[PDB]
Amino acid sequence: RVERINGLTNLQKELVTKYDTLPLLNMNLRLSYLRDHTYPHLQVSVQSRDRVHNDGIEVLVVNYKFCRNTMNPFEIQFKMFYKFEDSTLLKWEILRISTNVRLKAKQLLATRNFQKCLLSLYE
Amino acid sequence: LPSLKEYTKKSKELKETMGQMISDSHEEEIKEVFV
Amino acid sequence: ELRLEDNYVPTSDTLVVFKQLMKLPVTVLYDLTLSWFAKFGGSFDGDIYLLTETLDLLIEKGVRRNVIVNRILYVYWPDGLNVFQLAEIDCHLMISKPEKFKWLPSKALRGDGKPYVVKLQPAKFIENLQTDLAKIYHCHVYMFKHPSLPVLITRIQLFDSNLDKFQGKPLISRRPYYVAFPLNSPIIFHSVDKDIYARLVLQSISRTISERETIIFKPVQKIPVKSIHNIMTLLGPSRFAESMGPWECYASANFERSPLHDYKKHQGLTGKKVMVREFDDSFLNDGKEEPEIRRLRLEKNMIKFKGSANGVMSRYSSLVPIEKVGFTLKNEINSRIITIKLKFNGNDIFGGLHELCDKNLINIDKVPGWLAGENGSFSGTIMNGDFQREQ
Amino acid sequence: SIKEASEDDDISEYFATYNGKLVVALEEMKLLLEEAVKTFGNSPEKREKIKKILSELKK
Amino acid sequence: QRLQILDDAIQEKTSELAEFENMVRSPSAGDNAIPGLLQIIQSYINLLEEN
Amino acid sequence: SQDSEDDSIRDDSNILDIAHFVDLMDPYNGLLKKINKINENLSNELQ
């Protein structure tokens, strides 16, 4: 029996048809891992992934809400410009910073390589 | 290192200026009465 | 004074050198002749440009390599080849024919037990090695970098002492000992030799690498493997080390792309085509099965043994052929340790096992990880489901 | 931060004017709190104002 | 010479700190008015919270 | 001797004071901007 499995496949149905070493495609399970285990207490949110298909450039805006200190959590909002093929980050800019982390993030975000910025903010 | 004593006196002057600025600001007086 | 310089001539048999240069192509012979006459010179009289023009006339004459071999062994250097020549021709044979040499890996452990990532200053390392080995034997060492691989291969040649044997005044050579240094890796590849001279060379190498804290070489494998490219794929500082067999997909990263990429071509959206594997014992019970699901079970065996659906690219040939592996599987069936010793032999163990799995002789749903090519070229004991290698 | 938040930079003048702005800000906040106390003096409004002041001051 | 270049870097940093120190020295004596306003505001806020 | 501190060969009270002073007059969070936030909250609650 030939079966097609996608990102919305059941976990039991995936374990029925598992004979490779690739990671599990159950995307709810993948995001459950990503939310609960590697980065807990972080309410990420994406709200606009609009694109300029003439240039082949994707515009992404995400909100990172570091809610480990639930009384006064500090949140940030990025804007990324993809290349959507031959993936190059042409430009990224910081749309909004919460004022209670604004100075430390202002000193940190002045440098490039925003992956370090996100990891440093979470740490 | 002759410049260590220079930093000692410079940091003493800077700390004195910052301390008198903080005392003029009265942050500790308004902090306790706001909680 | 016991160190051997790059201008001494040893006693080498002319016929052995004659048959040794036969295997080299004409263009490396040309490059060697110009480099040798530019550095050391020869008995032939002429300008360097004049000799370049003479070899040019030889190469647009289309002459066979035999004539130029007789020339460079009979008029250019009739008395005998210098040690640098004898080392460089054999290193060029190593470059031309890498499959004719077998290597043995050895980790560079140090101090507490953390491996030492060996880094070489090549000229100073050669000078220090030659001065260290000069105290014991008549040593000449030659070092070069691979044109393709990121290694530093040395060649250590040791010379001994010498009815009435008339007179030779010789210095008889032995078989050279090769030690390959990868750029940044604790694993050290050396030639297969267990006599006292090989131990001396490895000992002097360990003493002359260190210079800060004492370093010991512990052998991580006792079965030699051919083809230096393969031993860099296995034990060298690459991604394919510690990800082999069914896990070569992680070492090649052909299944995931960057997070900055198109999300319409993601694996979870397009999906992949698989088959329901029967967990009930039905392999032993069972003809002209459908050619689409036959392709899927062939792909299943291909995935299990090479990691990729299309493989790392007849088609059974793995990324690294393995000659000898021996696994000692141990289980605990009701408080009894039950050992099974599986030994293997051939030109490519896991390719042959893949072919046997394709012929429905071995169940691909029950073939374990270590049999499938995981932690390849390592022979060890499987206790509690965990493979620990032998020593 | 002061340089990009002023646009008239004169950063030495930021501190005396900081003290003056603090004085006028406290007297203005005094005026607003007196107006809020005299205007309603209710139960829900006073509790909401106290909670807002405590939340904005402590955190 | 290593300590010389270390002391030169330290001296440059002290010059920067002294530049900042002249930049912040603002003479004032207005703390009494701020303290009185804070005391009055605290008393009125306590009176409002008491109701 | 043992209970003495006259040469600042290693001191970190100054960096603590620098951090406190910077946190005090921050143009974004600071002390004056907290007072302004209290002002806007009181204005929204009253008017």
Side-chain angles (χ1 to χ4, degrees), chain D residues 5-7 10-12 18 23 27-28 35:
Chain D
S6 293
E7 292 83 4
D10 63 358
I11 315 294
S12 44
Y18 181 91
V23 173
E27 66 93 20
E28 186 170 315
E35 284 158 323

Side-chain angles (χ1 to χ4, degrees), chain C residues 52 83 161 183 248 250 281 362 370:
Chain C
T52 303
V83 191
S161 175
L183 289 181
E248 305 177 13
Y250 293 106
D281 293 358
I362 297 173
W370 42 273

Side-chain angles (χ1 to χ4, degrees), chain A residues 3-4 7 21 49 51 85 87, chain C residues 246 250 260-261 265 268 274:
Chain A
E3 190 44 74
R4 183 71 160 270
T21 54
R49 48 186 179 84
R51 45 181 60 243
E85 186 72 279
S87 289
Chain C
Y250 293 106
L260 212 66
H261 201 252
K265 293 187 286 185
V274 287

Side-chain angles (χ1 to χ4, degrees), chain C residues 104-142:
Chain C
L104 271 168
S106 304
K107 204 191 291 293
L109 295 168
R110 81 166 202 259
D112 55 356
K114 315 298 179 188
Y116 174 83
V117 185
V118 61
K119 315 154 173 293
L120 282 76
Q121 279 271 108
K124 185 192 52 53
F125 175 74
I126 287 308
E127 166 194 1
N128 281 328
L129 193 152
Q130 197 163 345
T131 54
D132 186 26
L133 268 176
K135 293 182 187 297
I136 295 294
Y137 263 104
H138 290 87
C139 193
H140 169 271
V141 63
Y142 167 75

Side-chain angles (χ1 to χ4, degrees), chain A residues 4 73 75-76 79 110:
Chain A
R4 183 71 160 270
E75 57 181 357
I76 204 176
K79 192 199 199 95

Side-chain angles (χ1 to χ4, degrees), chain B residues 4-5 7-8 11-12 14-15 18 21-22 25-28 30 34, chain F residues 6-9 11 13-14 17-21 24-25 31 35 38:
Chain B
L4 277 181
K5 294 172 179 291
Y7 173 108
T8 289
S11 282
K12 279 306 176 51
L14 181 63
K15 197 203 313 303
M18 271 145 67
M21 178 84 64
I22 285 180
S25 81
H26 273 282
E27 201 272 342
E28 273 291 339
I30 69 172
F34 274 21
Chain F
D6 46 355
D7 293 301
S8 74
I9 192 167
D11 196 359
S13 82
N14 59 6
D17 289 345
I18 281 172
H20 181 33
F21 168 82
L24 175 58
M25 63 184 73
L31 183 59
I35 294 298
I38 290 175

Side-chain angles (χ1 to χ4, degrees), chain C residues 278-286 359-366:
Chain C
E278 316 203 284
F279 291 88
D280 54 79
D281 293 358
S282 301
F283 181 74
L284 291 179
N285 293 330
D286 55 354
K359 292 192 243 193
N360 276 326
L361 304 183
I362 297 173
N363 199 344
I364 202 75
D365 307 293
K366 279 163 164 294

